[PDB]
């Protein structure tokens, strides 16, 4: 039975009319926040007087 | 049963009217002492002729 039966092409199109965007390019931004916290303190205790 | 039960917070005061004190530093002093001894003599013993 040997024989072709079928095939496939890489035809491609011409893009000439823009028919295909292809990828699109958005610009983004992404925000971080860092709050600062405050600390235990150290105390010198000296006596009045 | 997929939910949530509870959390935690890094919550902290502002000691703003300063209720915690915190560590103390405090001065210290120590002495220590080296009294020096005697030691036996050696001696170069003659006549006195």
């Given at each position: 039975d040997l024989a072709?039966?079928?095939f496939e092409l890489d035809?491609?199109?011409t893009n000439t009319?823009?028919?295909q965007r292809g990828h699109l390019?958005?610009?983004r931004?992404?925000?971080f926040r860092h709050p600062i916290?405050?600390?235990a303190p150290v105390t010198l205790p000296m006596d009045t007087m």
């Open positions: 072709v039966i079928g035809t491609r199109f009319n823009r028919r390019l958005q610009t931004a992404l925000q916290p405050m600390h």
